[PDB]
Every structure is written in C-alpha cells, then in structure tokens.
Amino acid sequence: HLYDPTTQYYTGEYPKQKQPAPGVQAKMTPVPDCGEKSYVGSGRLKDRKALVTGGDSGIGRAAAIAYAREGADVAINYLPAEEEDAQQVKALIEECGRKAVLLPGDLSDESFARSLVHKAREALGGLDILALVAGKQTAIPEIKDLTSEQFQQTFAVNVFALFWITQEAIPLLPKGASIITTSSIQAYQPSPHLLDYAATKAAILNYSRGLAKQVAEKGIRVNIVAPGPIWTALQISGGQTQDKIPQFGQQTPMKRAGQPAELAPVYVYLASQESSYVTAEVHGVCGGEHLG
Amino acid sequence: HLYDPTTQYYTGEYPKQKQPAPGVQAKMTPVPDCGEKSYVGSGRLKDRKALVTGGDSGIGRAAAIAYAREGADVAINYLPAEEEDAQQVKALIEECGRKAVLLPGDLSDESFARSLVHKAREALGGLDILALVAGKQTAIPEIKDLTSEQFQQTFAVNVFALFWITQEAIPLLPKGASIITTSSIQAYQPSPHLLDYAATKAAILNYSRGLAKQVAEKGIRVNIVAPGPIWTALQISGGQTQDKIPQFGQQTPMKRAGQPAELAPVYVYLASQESSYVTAEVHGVCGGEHLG
Amino acid sequence: HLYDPTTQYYTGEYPKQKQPAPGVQAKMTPVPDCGEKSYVGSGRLKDRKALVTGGDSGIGRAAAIAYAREGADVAINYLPAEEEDAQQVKALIEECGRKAVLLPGDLSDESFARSLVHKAREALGGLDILALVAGKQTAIPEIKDLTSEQFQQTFAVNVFALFWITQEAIPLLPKGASIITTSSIQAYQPSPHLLDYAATKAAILNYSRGLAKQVAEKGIRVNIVAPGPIWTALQISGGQTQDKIPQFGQQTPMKRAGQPAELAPVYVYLASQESSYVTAEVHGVCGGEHLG
Amino acid sequence: HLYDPTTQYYTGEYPKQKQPAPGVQAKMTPVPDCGEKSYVGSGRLKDRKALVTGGDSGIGRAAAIAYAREGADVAINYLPAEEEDAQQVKALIEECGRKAVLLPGDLSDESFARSLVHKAREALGGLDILALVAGKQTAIPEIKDLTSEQFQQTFAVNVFALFWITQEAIPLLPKGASIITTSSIQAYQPSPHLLDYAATKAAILNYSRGLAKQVAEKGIRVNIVAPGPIWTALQISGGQTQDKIPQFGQQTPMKRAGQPAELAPVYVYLASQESSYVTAEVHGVCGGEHLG
Numbered sequence A, B, C, D: 001h002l003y004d005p006t007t008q009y010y011t012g013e014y015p016k017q018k019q020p021a022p023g024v025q026a027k028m029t030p031v032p033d034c035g036e037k038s039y040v041g042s043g044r045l046k047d048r049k050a051l052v053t054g055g056d057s058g059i060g061r062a063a064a065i066a067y068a069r070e071g072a073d074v075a076i077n078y079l080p081a082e083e084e085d086a087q088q089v090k091a092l093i094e095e096c097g098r099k100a101v102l103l104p105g106d107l108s109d110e111s112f113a114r115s116l117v118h119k120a121r122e123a124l125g126g127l128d129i130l131a132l133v134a135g136k137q138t139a140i141p142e143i144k145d146l147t148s149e150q151f152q153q154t155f156a157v158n159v160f161a162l163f164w165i166t167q168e169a170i171p172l173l174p175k176g177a178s179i180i181t182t183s184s185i186q187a188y189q190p191s192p193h194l195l196d197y198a199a200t201k202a203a204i205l206n207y208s209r210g211l212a213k214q215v216a217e218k219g220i221r222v223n224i225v226a227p228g229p230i231w232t233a234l235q236i237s238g239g240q241t242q243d244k245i246p247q248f249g250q251q252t253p254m255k256r257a258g259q260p261a262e263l264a265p266v267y268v269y270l271a272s273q274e275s276s277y278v279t280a281e282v283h284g285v286c287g288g289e290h291l292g
Ligand SMILES: NC(=O)c1ccc[n+]([C@@H]2O[C@H](COP(=O)([O-])OP(=O)(O)OC[C@H]3O[C@@H](n4cnc5c(N)ncnc54)[C@H](O)[C@@H]3O)[C@@H](O)[C@H]2O)c1
Pocket: A022, A023, A025, A053, A054, A055, A056, A057, A058, A059, A060, A077, A078, A079, A082, A105, A106, A107, A108, A133, A134, A135, A136, A137, A157, A182, A183, A184, A185, A226, A227, A228, A229, A230, A231, A232, A233, A234, A235, A260
C-alpha cells in the first residue's frame, strides 16, 4: 500500500493568518499535523528519558509524540503563552502510557535555560535524549529595520541557549545518550529577509559538529536536523512575511510544504541507539530543496 | 539498556590481509558484521519489493538483510566470484520468511545492467525500492600508476551503471517508490590515493540530487547514503593500501571503523514511506568524520 | 570611477538562437564579451607558459586573453569547426605582444588529449599554467531521452580528458606550476535537465581537490573555478533548452547573466604565484547564485 | 622565476610562546610576514577608500598594506592596546603615498562599532571598501571550562559587530562598494577546542551571503575570505592551546602554515571592481585544507 508522497499531506494554498509570536498552533488553519493520528512506535526508545525544547508545537511536538510512542518518558519546555498546546502534548504522551513533564520558561533567561536540564532529569528520573528544537524566527526584509534587540534575542534563543543547555547536560549524560539539534535549509541558503535567523541556523549546525567531536569520547552523540519549509506556528507568527504564506512550500520539488509529522522519523533514528555510527551529521527534510 | 557507541563494535587493530577484488567477506578477519544476528524489523517495508546491488556483502548486504527483516522481498546483484557470500544472503532473506532472488552479473556491461531491472521486476512481481550499493574502489597513491582502463572502469561501475539502472527503472516505478544511492565521505574529502573513486562518489551524489528533482513529480524519491570508514571487503581487496588497514577507522572521532550493520537503519529510513518529505538528501554515517 | 556591477554588463533579455554544438561565438547575438577591450595586465604572469582548453571562445577565451595580457605565452585547444573564433584569439594574444599557438583537436580522443600537453610544451618552450575549460553540455529534460552515447561523451570531454591531460602533464610541470579546472554552480545545485553534465561538474571539482593533495609535494597547485550563468556558445548550442534563453541569468541576485570577461580575474589570481597558499579550493563567479 | 609555494615560507616548528590577548605581533618569535617587503600594487584600487578592522596586525594588516599599495586610502581599526603594531601600519600606508587613518576602539561596544563607519568615511572623504577582519578566538578544550562571558564576547566581536558595522554602512555605501568579511576553515571543519569561535565563523559566512542577496540591488557586493592556519598573534594570545603551537600548520597538504602576506591577493581581488560578478562567495586560503 504505497502512497504518493507529493499528495500525502495538504497541498492547497494556506489561508493568510497571523498570530503574535510564538503562536498557538491549535489556532492555525489548518492545524499542523504532528503525527498525533499516524505515528506508530516499535519500542526503539524503550525506557529512554527525553527533554524536548519547543515540545508544545510544530517539529518539537512531533518529536515528543514519537518519542513517547517509541517508549520514552518526555519532558517538554515551551513558553507560558503556549500552555494550551503543551497540555495537548501532555495528554498525547500520557496516552502512550508514558510520563509527561511540563517545564515552561523562557530560554533567553540563562539561569532558566541552565536550570532546565536539572529540573527535567530530577522529574524524569534520568536523562538520555535531548532534542533541542525551540527557535525564534522573525522576517525583516530590509536591514535598516532589523534592530539590535531582535538580532541579539534571536542569537540568545537559538545559539546561546543551545550552549547553556548542552554545557549543563554533558556532565550528566550517560554513555549512549543522544543530542539532536535543529538547523535549517537557511544554514546553506540564507534568505535576505532572515539575516539574523539564518546566521543562527548556521551557528547551530557548526556548534553541534564541534560539540560532537568533543564529546564522542564520553559516548555521547550529537547530530543535527535541518528542515525545509514546514507548516508551523513559527511561520505564521512573524517567521514569514504575510504575502509568502499562501504558496508556502510550493517552490520545493515536491510542490508542497512539509508537515511536522514528517520530521519525527529522523528525530527517532538519531535518538535511537541504531544510529551508533552517526555523530556530527546533518539530516535534511526539505521536500527536495536540498542541503549543501 | 544503553551502550557506549564507541565500544559497541570491533575496536582492535585489523590484521593486514589482502584478497583479489571484489573479495569474499567470509575470508576476512574479522568478518564484517552486517546485522545478521542483531537487526530486528517492525514491518516498515511490508510487502515492498527491493533490488540491492552489492547485496552479497558489506553495506549492500546489511541493507538487503534489513529490508527482508522489515518485510520486503529482495533481489540482489553481485559478481559471480561472490556466489558464496550471495548464498549466505539468500538464506538470510529466506529465514525472514521473504523471497530472495539472486541475479549475478557485471554492472559494467551496459546490456546486463539495463536487463537487471527487468529481471528483478519479473522475479519479484514488481519493484519499488532500489538500493544501489555496488562499487569499485582501487587505491593508487601516484597518478603515474593510475591507468586509463582503471579510471574508466571505476566510472562504469559506479556512475554509468547508476544511470543505466535508474533510466530503465523510472518508467516502471510506482508512486511511492524509493531509490537510495551510495556516495562516501570521499565525495567531500577526496583522498589523494583515490582520484577516480572519490570523483565517482561526488558524481553519484550530484546525479542523485538532479534525478530526485526530475522524478519528484512522478512520486519517486531519490536519496543518498555517504558512509565513512566501514570495515568491508572493498577495503581489503585493493580499496586501501595495505599499511592503512591496521588503523583503519581509528582517526574518526569515535576511534573505530563502522560495521555494515550500522548502515542498515538509514537505508530502511529512506526506503520507508516514513521519509515522505525527504528527497535529494545525503545522509552521513561516518563516526564523526562528517560530511560537508 | 566606481561602477554599479548590476548594470556594468547587459541586463536585458536574449533572443532565442540555436547553433549546432559547439557553436561559433562570432555568430551569437549578442557576441559574448571576453574582455577584449577591457582587460589590463600588470605582468602577474610574465613569461609564464599556458595551455588553455576551450581557449577559442567563452570563459576559456577570457582566460587566454587575460593570460596574454598578464605576460604569458598561450597555447589554445578547441575543435576545428571553431577555427574562426580561434583565429580571433590568436590575433588578441599577439596584440598583447605574446606568442599564440593554436592546437585544434577533439579531447574525447585519448591519444589527442595526451599528445596536446607535449605539443603545447614543445611549441611554447615550457609549460607552467594549465587552464582546463573545455566542456560539453546538453540539456535533456526527461531521462528517457538521455542516451548512453551522450552520457558517456559528456564524461569523456569533461572528466576523462581532464584526467588524461593532467596525468600527462604532472611529470613535466615545474615547481610553481598552477592547474585551474572548471566546475559550475551545477556541482552544488544540479538541474534536472542536466543529469550527466552536472554530475561531471561535481566529478571535476572532486578530482581537482584530490589531485591537489597528491601533487602538493611536487610544488604544483590545483584549483577550481565554478561559474554561474555566463552568456556563451555552450548555452545556445544545446546547453540550455530554448525556452530558458530569453531570461538567462535574470534569476541571480544581480539580475543578469555574467559575461566571460568577468571570469578572467579569478583565472589570473589562481595562475599567479600570488595564490601560493591556495590549493584544492573552488571559486564561485555566479552573480550571487552562490556555491556551497 | 617560478617558486615552489610549499617552501616559499617557513615550514618548521614554532616556539611555544604566549601573550595576553589580543597580542602584539611585533613581539612574536617570529613576527608574521604581512607582505611589507613583497606586495606590489598595480593600481587596482586607485583612489578607493577602505576601512579595515583588525588592520594593525595579521591578516587585516596584510589587507591594509596591499590596499594602500593598490592605490587606496586606508583607515584601520584595532584595539588601542595594539598601538605598537598599528603605528607600523600607518607608516606602511603612508610610504605608498596614501592617507592613513588610525581609529582604535573596542568593537564589542555597539556605540563605538556604529560610530566607526562614520568616522572613517569622514576622515577618508568617502568609503567604498570594508574589510572586516577583527576577531576574537580563545581555545578551550573542554566545555566545562567555556564561560558564558567568553561565549558571548566571541559572538559580540565576531558576529554582532559585523552586523552593527554593516547595518550602519549600507545606507552610505555607493554603487560599486565591496564588503569583505572573514570566516575560516573552522566554519566547515569546527575543532572541539573552538566551540564558540567556530560557530561565529559559520555565522559570519552565512550572514555575509544573506546580506549579499539583500544588497545586490544597491550595487554593493559582499564576499567572504576563509583562511586556514595562518601564523598570527591571534594564535599565540590564546587562540590555540600551547601544545598546538609547535606543529601549527604542518597538517595541511602544503605542510606549513600560511603567512598573512598570502591572504592579501584575495582581499584585493574581492575589493577590486574586477570581481563584478562575484557576490555571496567564500574564498579559501588554506594550504590545501580546503573548504566545502
Ligand atoms: N517550520 C519551518 O519551516 C522550519 C524550517 C527549518 C527549521 N525550523 C526549525 O524548527 C524549530 C521548531 O520550530 P517549528 O517550525 O516547529 O515552529 P513552532 O513554533 O511550533 O516551534 C518553535 C518553538 O520555539 C519555542 N520557543 C521560541 N522562543 C522561545 C523562548 N524564548 N523560550 C523557550 N521556547 C521558545 C516555542 O516553544 C515554540 O513552540 C525551530 O528551531 C526552527 O528554526 C523550522
């Protein structure tokens, strides 16, 4: 029973729609499909313990759902404004028979970002998967309109918090632990309206590779997922200009945007012990708008 | 039950050993682990129909085994000299309860290479996975010793046969079909003893991306796997100079070579319908000697 | 005296035109600008001795002209059907005060490709720059229409001849010699209508890097130039489909195609002893349609 | 005469030595060669007006010297603790018959970084080349020892100051202006002792490409230079561990480090109007330790 991947998910134009960042995905048209009805596990992460940032919505939610479906207990971080989305994820994790831990807070607060790993490990009784998916993205077509405050904040959420969290995690992660970070096609093909954001995506990719090299001897793997155009709240809450929303994703070879569901399998592959010889590698999921 | 990936597979030095190309893996010390005793499926390729070139040994064998474990019927191609290795794979596929088809023949013979798709499709009653893993690799440290015959033959097996097979397959492949080709870290970091070989690995990566773009509209995906140093018969039958064998793999961040078993999960991910938004992408499995 | 690079060269649309390959650039509308009236040398290649393949027209011609302007004697190879264009380059070289040598012949003939190096060295009294610019490019939008004959011929001209020439040259090249090969943006972003061609451009880039590593100890440097869309005979003699000619180049950030003249400065930089710490590197000239 | 580039500059081991950052290159053993006696101009930048950050020492010094030798007036920025180096550069610029402007100040201060562009333009009577070479680099082999203060300072100097300067410059730069930023091999091959630094080098590369796309229509070009191992004060004032100093550079295919002199030619190529079809491109100068 083979499906055509070009028509498997929504292929129509997206309604124009806007929300204040970071957005509530439950309010979108359509709501992003994060695999709630479709993802089926096979115990590839049995009794693993995961922290997922951005686990309330979008790609991080797809990873959180799949991780629970594969047998892991899951802590999610997200912003308080996203509590309604986070509560849906709590229910999805618990329905898998797993433990859900909800740890809201702002990753641009260094002390919060540092405390998070320890709170999650205590609540879960361990920690051996980190999926760092949270991100800020604000489209600004002309550099004269790009403020210092925005530029620095994008780096704080996307790069500095990645350092703060991983620095706290390394000493406590067991041999076999897996860290998955989140870059973008933008790391390779930066758009002129995402000067700060695309540069953070490049920094994430590079930092992840350097960290991988440094911690390989501790038995810890660090890998990167770089999605292409995925239908998510990040894109309707300022990540794209409003005029780009209707045809979002249609320029890819597959002629549609991805849904977050389609990211879960690679997050599972990388978390799983099956990817034992994989570290420092980036994985594209871009509808043919390929990395390189 | 978490394992340290750095110590999970062989970490000793490799004895010096040499066989005539293409080599018989059963004569190696150690014999490459292709997942015979470890790979467990979950129905991710149920009733799929795969052709795997190089399916007798090494990475292609690991893919063939995993595909059968995941529920697929499998045809393998290999050279007659490798019949003993291919017979072991026949048994492994049949022990999964699936159909095995052995189609020996030389891929540098265009008429044979083109016929292979038709033979596999007839035997299997269809065809919807192609894993193109066969390759020639001959180390020559100084260009004065690199013959035109060798250079051309490396391109025939690694590039021309990829074109011949894929051209024959495209008109027959159903929507949802998945093609997986095999590049190398050498495509990004070519070594001076592999002038022809590394250039073919770069050509494979590029051709696969172009093909992906061309066939996306037909619902066919084309992706690339690029391994790092993996212990296989290719490496002991002329792919490496003899002096490079004992320490093979030890320069990677993980400080060991990979085993073919470790490549099967990505070949399954890419064959599976789960990778619906993945086309034209390369996937590294290199022990931290990363692509880019 | 600063000019706007966006408007420095023609920014408008091109008329459809087709010539049989390889094309006569003197018959194009408009004729490509190869720097005939603009390039000014300063002795950076004084008394050097260059062989330039494809030196009759296009990018190779721009390199040949600039090399003579910088003080080098220059031998050009080209196909005999291109004699009109070659005779123009002969005059241009002589008008720089240097010696021109015209060595027509088909690089897909291995005997001729190998002899070329020796004929050029004998005629020039030495040889210490090789600019390998000749290429075949044939657009075929659907793989069903891509013949084995075309695929192999593309590899013969673009890859095998590069190997034949460089193998023949290495034993005779002095310390300080510089080899410059020619890839493309297509090596990174292959178009579905150029499956064979783009794969050769990737192979050239890779082979050049491996060769650079092998011959560094001999004091020889090997570097690569990867142009973007440049207005040339290759593009109107089958390299592009006719429908792609009118707006050729207009998709780049600079909104125009390049002219061959604009490639000369990087060919000079790489030939010159000034690039002493540069080997195995690729240099993009793409109007902002950047390489990786 | 033709020179062997592998032995053109020193090939042996370097004494261990340390200075407080940012170092004084005049006190190094040996002092880096920045082209003081070797670089000869030909008017390629006649009457151009350049600002060079890090213009006191190392690669920025080599660019500043070459720019003046090619006919440009040159303003240099540097930290005021570097006056011993900066004063030498003033003399070198003036000895070419050009105007020198010394504008010291710490680029991590946003107000200073923004003011710098205006002060330089006022002092020079215009501004049409920006070579942004300043950088902080601090080796820390283990993440436990990498402080937030260091991480953020490395991003302030290397990334935020690049944004501050370029944002301030764009509105005032004429058509034809050229911006050259400075990345590294580390952007592609990050080392585990340089987690923050290498990530900044990837961010610089990416931001530069995005900026180039945004400002192409304004007739401004933006390109990147990515050196390999170059003997400079950055390396002996904390950028490398002491144990990495003795064999610095010997791992490249050329088997030596570069000297800053060897970077000048690409900075001139990119500043010059000759590179009219070059924007968003990165240029490696790495002794064969090539970029992607
Ligand atoms: N959607 C795409 O097209 C796309 C493409 C490439 C990469 N990405 C990456 O995917 C990741 C997830 O985003 P998404 O697209 O799934 O959208 P999303 O909006 O569903 O997820 C982003 C999440 O970031 C978190 N976040 C933002 N700022 C935060 C802060 N200050 N503190 C704590 N959490 C914060 C929020 O919890 C939010 O749910 C991001 O890193 C993004 O860069 C997305």
